[PDB]
Amino acid sequence: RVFRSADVHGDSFPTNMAVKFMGDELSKLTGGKDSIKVFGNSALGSEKDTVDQVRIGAIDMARVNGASFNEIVPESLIPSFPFLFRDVDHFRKAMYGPAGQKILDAFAAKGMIALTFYESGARSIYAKRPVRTPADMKGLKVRVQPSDLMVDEIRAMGGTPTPMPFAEVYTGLKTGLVDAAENNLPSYEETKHFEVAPDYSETQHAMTPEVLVFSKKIWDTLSPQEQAAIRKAAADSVPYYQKLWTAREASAQQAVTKGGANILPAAQVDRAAFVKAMQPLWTKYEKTPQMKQIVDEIEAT
Ligand SMILES: O=C(O)[C@H]1O[C@@H](O)[C@H](O)[C@@H](O)[C@H]1O
Ligand SMILES: [Ca+2]
Ligand SMILES: [Ca+2]
Ligand SMILES: [Cl-]
């Protein structure tokens, strides 16, 4: 049947496109039994709300950021840890390997089947002034996702964190409720945040993944063959997503720069000042030997 899936991004965004592709692939594998419709633009609710809905079986699927599980699935904290991944190649090798699998596995006890990760580049601060160091962060009202870890990350960077839904951030910046936020370049572009917060400073403080989750209540009513079809379609969507995403990182950078944004490259940012300040959070959020082991498996990749 038609599975309903949520996304905060617009229809043309790579996450929406990848799950629509998954849906097309899935309909074939199931002899037309199944397809997916993606409701974008936060139509079904904030990310938080849609995760609640997936967990109770009110919607079938959601494509959400890892941060949105940080208070539900402890293992989801790990890939949001600051400066955990060395670069994108490290993210890919670790997150599509056994370490990433252990993180996906942890979702089942909380009513969700985590089918796949998608990469989300690196999140960086943007604002109305450049940011090279924490002193530069001091005084900024910085929107964060509603995650205790992300609140702590931005506080350690020196900003004053304020949680808000993604859809509300643009107006928050345009009207001065907040002075800053953080995200990857494609999101900075899509939302037009770059028009009102033109200084994008490559702090690259997190490389949090996206996660595609399926309601376990619904999943549990499916046959092993249907389940295997859905898992195959999700896996097959990843190289498709990666083609779109890598192109979008490049096009977003050019578009925001053409549109007046000033990107401060990572090399000019004192990752030094940010790394030593944020590291302790790893120890704070390592809540089990299992989490410690996952972090270790990631680092050893
Ligand atoms: O900051 C946000 O709220 C958003 O960040 C984006 O990178 C992510 O794709 C979204 O799912 C959402 O979490
Ligand atoms: Ca809640
Ligand atoms: Ca360790
Ligand atoms: Cl949201």
Record: fold of 1-301 = D-Maltodextrin-Binding Protein; domain 2 (3.40.190)
CA of 68 to the centre of ligand 2 (A): 10
> Is 1 annotated as a binding-site member?
no
CA of 293 to the centre of ligand 3 (A): 7
Query: Is the Cβ–Cβ distance between 185 and 121 less than 8 Å?
Result: yes
Ligand nearest 183 Cα, by number?
A: 1
Cα 175 from Cα 194, distance rounded (Å): 14
Cα 192 from Cα 123, distance rounded (Å): 16
Residue nearest to atom 9 of ligand 1 (CA): 65
Give residue for tokens 């998954």: 22
Task: Using CA atoms of 301, 149, 199, 86 in order, give the dihedral in degrees to the nearest 10.
Answer: -10
- Name the residue among 24, 45, 72 with its Cα closest to residue 240: 24
Closest-lying ligand 1 atom to the alpha carbon of residue 184: 7
Closest-lying ligand 1 atom to the alpha carbon of residue 68: 13
Cα 54 from Cα 215, distance rounded (Å): 5
Task: Convert 8-61 into a string of H (helix), E (strand) and C (coil).
Answer: CCCCCCHHHHHHHHHHHHHHHHCCCCCEEEEECCCCCCCHHHHHHHHHHCCCCE
Q: Please, what sign has the CA dihedral across residues 14, 213, 8, 141?
A: negative
List residues near ligand 1 (CB under 6 A): 8, 47, 64-65, 67, 120, 145, 166, 183-184, 187, 210
Strands of the sheet containing 123-127, edge to edge, are 160-163, 141-144, 180-183, 123-127, 199-206, 262-264
CA of 103 to the centre of ligand 3 (A): 16
CA of 149 to the centre of ligand 4 (A): 16
Q: How many residues does the chain have?
A: 301
Q: What is the largest CA-CA distance in the chain?
A: 59
Of 47, 212, 213, the residue with max ligand 1 atoms within 8 A of its CB, to mutate for a pocket test, comes to 47
Cα 158 from Cα 136, distance rounded (Å): 8
Q: How many CB atoms lie within 10 A of CB 150?
A: 26
Let me know if 82 is exposed, middle or buried by CB neighbors in 10 A (0-12, 13-18, 19+). buried
Cα 125 from Cα 132, distance rounded (Å): 10
- This structure was determined by X-ray
Resolution (A): 1.5
Q: Helix, strand, or coil here: 143?
A: strand
Q: How many CB atoms lie within 10 A of CB 171?
A: 12
> Is 210 annotated as a binding-site member?
yes
Cα 288 from Cα 296, distance rounded (Å): 13
CA of 190 to the centre of ligand 4 (A): 14
Cα 293 from Cα 299, distance rounded (Å): 10
Residue nearest to atom 10 of ligand 1 (CA): 65
Q: What share of the chain is helix, strand, coil (3-state, %, to 5)?
A: 50, 20, 30
The neighbouring-strand residues paired with 35 are: 2
What are the Cα distances from residue 211, in Å, to 66, 93, 115?
6, 16, 8
What are the Cα distances from residue 68, in Å, to 6, 9, 123, 204, 248?
13, 15, 15, 19, 23
Alpha helices in 57-184 (DSSP H): 88-95, 98-105, 134-137, 148-156, 169-174
Cα 61 from Cα 179, distance rounded (Å): 33
**Which residues are within 8 A (CB) of 123 and not within 5 positions of it... i.e. 6 or more apart?**
182, 183, 184, 204, 205, 206, 207, 208
Residue nearest to atom 2 of ligand 1 (CA): 166
The neighbouring-strand residues paired with 215 are: 112
Task: Enumerate the domain spans of the chain.
Answer: 1-301
Ligand nearest 65 Cα, by number?
A: 1
CA of 8 to the centre of ligand 4 (A): 7
**Which residues are within 8 A (CB) of 91 and not within 5 positions of it... i.e. 6 or more apart?**
79, 85, 119, 207, 209
Which amino acid makes up residue 7?
Answer: D
- Structure-token pair, residue 136: 């530069």
